[PDB]
Structure formats: C-alpha cells, structure tokens
Design a binder for these strands. Structure first.
Ligand SMILES: [Zn+2]
Lengths: 50, 84, 58, 154, 62
RNA sequence: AUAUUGGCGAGAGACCGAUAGCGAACAAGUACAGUGAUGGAAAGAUGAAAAGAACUUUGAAAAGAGAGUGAAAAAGUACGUGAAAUUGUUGAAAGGGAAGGGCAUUUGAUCAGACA
RNA sequence: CGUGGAGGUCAGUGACGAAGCCUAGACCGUAAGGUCGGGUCGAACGGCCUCUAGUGCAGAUCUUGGUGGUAGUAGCAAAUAUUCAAAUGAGAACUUUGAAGACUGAAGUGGGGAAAGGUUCCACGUCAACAGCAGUUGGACGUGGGUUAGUCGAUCCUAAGA
RNA sequence: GUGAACAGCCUCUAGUUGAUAGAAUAAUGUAGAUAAGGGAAGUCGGCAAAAUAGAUCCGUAACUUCGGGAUAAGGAUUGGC
RNA sequence: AGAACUGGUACGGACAAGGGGAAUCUGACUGUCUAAUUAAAACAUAGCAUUGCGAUGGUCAGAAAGUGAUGUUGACGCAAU
RNA sequence: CUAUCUAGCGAAACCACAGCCAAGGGAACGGGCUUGGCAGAAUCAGCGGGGAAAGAAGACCCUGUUGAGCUUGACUCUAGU
C-alpha cells in the first residue's frame, strides 16, 4: 500500500529491476542456449505474494 | 454465497515474511513460521517431508564457508605465506 | 547536455537498432510460441473441479 | 521454397507466397478456389466487385448453415458470402505475382492463375471462460497461401 | 495528432474542467509542441486555448 | 575385523537413452498454484564453419520473388532426419436413403518373364 | 517369426551413401514376417551359432502428447445513444480536436482515502502478441523520468490479549 | 426545483459519452403494455397481473391483556386565477 | 381557513404510492438458523418450576504441575435441566 | 433486444460405424439382419416424435464374511472418580 514498510519496498525495487527483457548481446555468445527471459513478471498476470 | 461473493473479503493477510527463510509463512497472530519455526531455535524438518528437506537443506545455498573445508583439509589445515 | 541514450549504450556494446528490432521480435515470437503450448496442454485438466455441487435435484 | 503440385514450365511462370497469415482458412480456401484457372485481370475485377458487394464468392465445402443469396446463381450454388479479409490478402499476392512476372519479363495480357492453394497453419490460442468455472479454447485458423501465374499457350 | 495531454494541462492551469476547455482545431500543429505548462499559459493568453462559460442554470421560474 | 541410499574424491557397468533414466541431460526443486503446511512441471540436436541471406524489385510494412552463401536451404534460427491422425492443390475412378468386406470374371491402369 | 543389448564369426554392408521414412511397384512364406527396386535422407548397421531380457497391443470411463466431424456453427443482445466535418495515418463505426445530442444527477459514472496491489503514475517511440470485432489508441511492447516533512503518520502509551 | 423527504423525475460544477457494428422487421422467445361482453367458469391453489394507494374533512364494529384493533371498514374533496 | 370566478368534470393529472373483510389450525410477541433446493408451527425468548453447591466446595479443564475457567465470584449467586 | 442476412471474431457437449419405413424373429420394443415398400445431387429456417439422445439425475431390492456416524442393560476395555 502507501503506508508500507521498507522490507517490502526493497522487494518491490528488486522486482522492478528484474522486470526487463533479456540483453540482446547475450544471444551472440558462443555456446548460448538462452533465447528469452523465462522469469518475467507483470502485475496483470502473476502477483508476487509478499 | 460461499464462493465468488465470499472471495471478495480476502484482503487481510495472516502470513508475512519470515526473517529466517524469507518466505510468506510467518503467522502474525501466533508469531511462528510454518516452514521453520522462527522463534524456535530448531528448523522444522520432519522425515515425512522428505521433499521439503531437499528444498531447504545443505547445498541449496551458497555454502560461503563450508565449501572450502574440503580444500583446506586436503592440504592439512595449514598456515602462512606460500613460497618464493 | 545528454551525451548518452540506451540506444547509444547498446550501439557501443555491439547491437545496432536493426539487430535490436529483429532480435526483440524473435524473443516476442518465442514467448507466444510457448504460451501456445501452455494454453494447449492445460485445457484438459483445468476444469477438473474437486467439489462441484451440480445445482440440479428437482 | 518448395511449392505444391505444379505442372508448368517455371520459365513462363511467376510465384507468390504468404505464410502465417491471420485469416480464416475456411473462407480463404473458397476465395482461392473461386479464381483458379482464371485470368488475373478478370480475377482482380471480380475481387473488387466482391468488396463492393457484387459478384459474391461461392462457398462449396465450408458452407454449413450459412445463408443463401442470389449472387451464387452465376456459379449454380445458392450459398455465398463476401469475405473481405481473405479477398484482401489474395489481392496482395496477385499484385506481388504480377510484379514478379513483369520483372521476369512476361506479358500480363495473357497470364492466368494456374496453381493456387491454401493450407492450414499453426493455431493461435486464447482462453474463453464459460459457466461453472471452466475454460475452453478460443483460437484462430491461420492460413498459408501460395500462388502461381503463368502465361497461356495452345 | 493527439492532444489528450494538452487538454488536461489546460484544465489544471486554468483552474477549470477538462470539459470547459476549447483547443483551436486550426492550431494542432502549434499546440502539439505545448508539452510544458508554461507553453499552455502562453497559448491561453494568445487565445488559442479558451475557457468556456458556464452552462446556464436559471432560477427565474422558481 | 564390522556398518554406511548422507558428504569429499575416484574407477567401472551384458543398465536408461530425452513420454525412458533422479522430479530435473536445458537459468529444476526453476516457472506456476495455494492463506499455509505443502504441491510441482514442460523444455535437448541448424551447419564443419554463421559463411545467419550483400544487392535489385512489388508492398504502408511483415513478407514475397530473384540473387547469393553452402556439399545440401529437400538445413533459413517457426532450423538434424521429419511418420501417422487431420488438411489443401493436381491427377485417376466411382456414387438413386450409408461405406467397407468374401468367391468369380469383364473393362482400365500396372508389373512380369520373355523360352531371347 | 520378430525386438533391445551381450560373447563369437562372415578378414560382412557403408559417405561411389548406413539406419530410418514413403511407395493400390515386384518376389518368398500357410502365417507371424523376410527380401528387392525407386524417391527422400545423411552415419552408422546387419546375416549365422549361442547368451540375456524393462521383448511384440485395437481396447483397460488406460497415461502423456497431438488432432478431427460437430462448425465458420451456438453465439459476441443487461447497464436509455449516438451523429457530422477536419487532422494524423498504408488503412479510422471505435484515435485526437471542434461542433451537436445525451447520461450519471451531490447515498453520483465526481473529488479523496483505509486494506490490498506494486510503478499500473508521466513522457518519447511503437502495435508481432493482449484489449473474445477493429485499432494509427491503451492499465499492453520497448526505453526512461518520477515519491523531498522538526509540525501528516509510524516510532511512544496501554486495551482485549500474547 | 417539485415534494414531508438524502425518495423517485429534471438540471448546474466535475466526469463520461465505454459495453462488436450495419441492414431487415418471419416464426418461437425475454422484458414491457392494451383489450370488447362476462368476471376465477381457469387452476392443486386467484401462482402471475390488475385494482387500491398521497394529503384534508367526516365516520369507524366485534373482540380486548383497556395498552390496541385502526390507515378498520366505509364516504367526500383535491387544479388555475 | 374560507368565498367567488374559470375549464371538454379535469385536477395526489407524470413520478411516487396500502387491496379490504369474516372464520379455523398453530406459535405468544420483536428476534435466529439449514452460506449454494427446506425461513417454518422448528431454535431462542421473558415468565414458571425443579436439582446441586456454604469454598478442605458444586460444574468443567489439563499429559502433569507450587496448574487452571466460573472467580475482580459467594445463594436476590454460580452451575445443570 | 434476440433469432434471421451480412463484415470480423469464433468455442462446446457428444461421437463403435452411422443415419427412410412396415412385419418377423431375436437378450422377449432394430439404424444395420430376413422378406417386402421404396430410393435422385447440394440445401435454408424451424421443430421438438425418435436416436431405449446426453449428464459429476431420485429413490427402490440384494450381495459383500467392505465401512463409517449414532444409541444401548450387546462383547472386550478405558480416562476419571
Ligand atoms: Zn521461516
């Protein structure tokens, strides 16, 4: 909520910095098997239960 | 209604984050994590939760200190500057 | 004064905007290709309610 | 690219193709079979009349429960429809094919569309939500199209 | 173009509603650069944005 | 002397060979569900080498067609081969409220061995 | 008869193309099945004497995966209601501006907040997917910016209680 | 504003003008309505619907735990200037 | 509150807004319950009556305890019906 | 407002194979068999006879050396006292 706690604002910040796609220069490395970011998250679909 | 109407009223938690396992198990009215009873010194581990032990036992983390012990034993728990 | 943009960072680190557009669209394609399978292999065992009451007696 | 069953000389033919399109396969097949063996000019005049709601498209296989009309009488059938989305993709590929035929050096006056076919494509899935807390699929029927024109002879 | 922002800013500037705000259609190309909120005041003053008057409610009959 | 499905290091198998074998050959106790205890997946292979399609042209663009790389795009990142169900085009044939099947032969196609 | 592996053997086949797959093309056998030609494909595989077994499927309201007829069908009908011109655009029933008609009608379709959610706020660019029609738009895609307290709150007190 | 009234109906400030659309107007339906004469003959049964309805005046029974019944029943009036 | 005058006898003109009466069975009443087939004559209720208990106690709990509820209590009370 | 026609979008139950009747016999009520009547592409809206239509329908009887809830002076025990 608005009147929240720092223990939760921390965990929301982490989720904000995690919510991005994959860097395209990872796909150019040699023995690469990562196509996309399979751990993505958005508020519509999956709630992080904290 | 016991279903769709009575699922609107689910807006106040009973579990919060534990400091010991980091997951939403810390009950608030009784103050006892349901995965590793936090105020209690012993972590919950029952032999019937044999899968649950896999998820929380040794190896499942970093092993900051422990993973150098086999290295330090192989050499004799030794000391000092190496060599020339 | 703004001597930096994310496009410029990724240009410095290899990828051009053409490469970025194409590789992005492929990563979008694959997500949908997988979501297809998750919606495909689920419709079977998703309506398997444990306690349906069947509102029909008389 | 490998195309379907084509009995023509490749030198007097020009090809086109459209893959992974989000039209209905069932309507596009009828739209495609309504112009097989035709000349490009008459086909392009016909497909525009359709959008103007004249000279309908006959529905012959995928025709169950649809409505009847009077623009089927020039084909014998009494069931027909005016599928704009399919018509538009088909017009695009006819354009592309005529361009390719021009670039290969063929005369548009006497081209005819020899081999046209549509295929099924991979579905695209969504959920619809029914009564009693159950899900069912709601998915499209996309289509590949491939097309060949070639110039007439004896 | 799209002036859905400029309308909102005009309201908040003028101190009036989003529905009493008139953007000149012949100056979309001028308004669309008014991203700022000073550049809305400049236009209000030029007359390219206008505050419309109250939809009258009259008390003569009562 | 004895025990040892755990831990560390090693050596091997008439074992499994990606619906198998540990649940996991892959960012697997991961994603995800659930208030919680707990539950718990799927997913391997281009090619020797990206040489991952310069350039032209139609299209608003995706793309298409040529061109090109390659031993091979009947390998084009939806990529080893690429079955079947199911489907489209072409060709052959048949068809009065089913179809299929057994015995016998005509007609059409096809094969034969040629005793050369 | 057939299958996966094991021991021997044919100094076995094979990149001049192994296996696999397709073949109303052929031969052998009562049959299980074997053999050949062609097409495709690209790296290992068979015959004989024996050993061994996680060894042969039409079924189990079988398991997993995939797919169909139904079927371009049922249907996308609650919440009084949309219309004109221009602009942008490849493209406008649905975007934007203006003009008109209307509604909520102050126990509101307003303005703010508690829980809860977590950056959904705002801007620029953008429309493959989503918005069960469409889409140039968007709570979506991508990139960034953004929350300023001696006085508001927590913090402090105790309640039922732990 | 009406009105006893935060009712219902209409408007001001603010907000929205969102819910897939066009054409046509068969049957059967959903929701809403009307109906000759008769008036529950229908039906398990007056289910459903209709009638009444506000305010002022008059008048209001049995019975009663004397407090009620009771808006009993039943009659009349209602505008504008 | 009253009187004239007036109108296609209209006028709480839209909205809004009770159908009434005579008798029986039953429960006294207001109230509560079968969330998602039973709202009732069932449950509760005040009222009446009984029973136990004068604290080293009556009723009840706990695995046990230097342990507990009634009890911050004391028969005009607690407990059980 | 739907249905109906059109543009776009676009599922599901169910499905041995499938779908014209009469009589016969038969697991005693045939879509298929037998003997007959007949039989001409492809079809639209409706319909509710049939498909012994479909479904996580209701109860009725029985068996089981299968159970569970509850009661009692069933059998065997037990906390407490
Ligand atoms: Zn914990």
């Amino acid at each position: 909520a608005a009147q929240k706690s720092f223990r939760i604002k921390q965990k929301m910040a982490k989720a904000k910095k995690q919510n991005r796609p994959l860097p395209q220069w990872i796909r150019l490395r040699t023995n690469n098997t990562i196509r996309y970011n399979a751990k993505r998250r958005n508020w519509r679909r999956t709630k992080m239960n904290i | 209604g016991k279903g769709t109407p009575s699922f609107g009223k689910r807006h106040n938690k009973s579990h919060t984050l534990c400091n010991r396992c980091g997951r939403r198990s810390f009950h608030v009215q009784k103050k006892t994590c349901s995965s590793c009873g936090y105020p209690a010194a012993k972590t919950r581990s029952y032999n019937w939760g044999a899968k649950a032990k896999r998820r929380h036992t040794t190896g499942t983390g970093r092993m900051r200190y422990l993973k150098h012990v086999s290295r330090r034993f192989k050499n004799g728990f030794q000391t000092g500057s190496a060599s020339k | 004064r703004r001597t930096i943009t994310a496009a410029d960072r990724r240009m410095v680190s290899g990828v051009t905007e053409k490469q970025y557009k194409k590789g992005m669209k492929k990563m979008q394609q694959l997500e949908k290709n997988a979501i297809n399978t998750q919606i495909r292999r689920e419709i079977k065992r998703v309506n398997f309610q444990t306690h349906y009451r069947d509102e029909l007696l008389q | 690219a490998r195309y379907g069953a084509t009995s023509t000389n490749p030198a007097k033919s020009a090809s086109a193709r459209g893959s992974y399109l989000r039209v209905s396969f069932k309507n596009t097949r009828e739209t495609a079979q309504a112009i097989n063996g035709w000349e490009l000019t008459k086909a392009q005049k016909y497909l525009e009349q359709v959008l103007d709601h004249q000279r309908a498209i006959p529905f012959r296989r995928f025709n169950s429960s649809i409505g009847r009309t009077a623009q089927g009488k020039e084909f014998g059938v009494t069931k027909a429809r005016w599928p704009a989305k399919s018509v538009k993709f088909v017009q695009g590929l006819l354009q592309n094919a005529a361009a390719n035929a021009e670039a290969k050096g063929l005369d548009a006056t006497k081209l005819y569309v020899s081999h046209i076919q549509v295929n099924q494509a991979p579905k695209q899935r969504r959920r619809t939500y029914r009564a009693h807390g159950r899900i069912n699929k709601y998915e499209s029927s996309p289509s590949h199209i491939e097309l060949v024109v070639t110039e007439k002879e004896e | 173009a799209n002036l859905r922002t400029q309308k909102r800013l005009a309201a908040s500037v003028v101190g009036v509603g989003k529905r009493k705000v008139w953007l000149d259609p012949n100056e979309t190309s001028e308004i669309a650069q008014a991203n700022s909120r000073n550049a809305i005041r400049k236009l209000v003053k030029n007359g390219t944005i206008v505050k419309k008057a109250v939809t009258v409610h009259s008390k003569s009959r009562t």
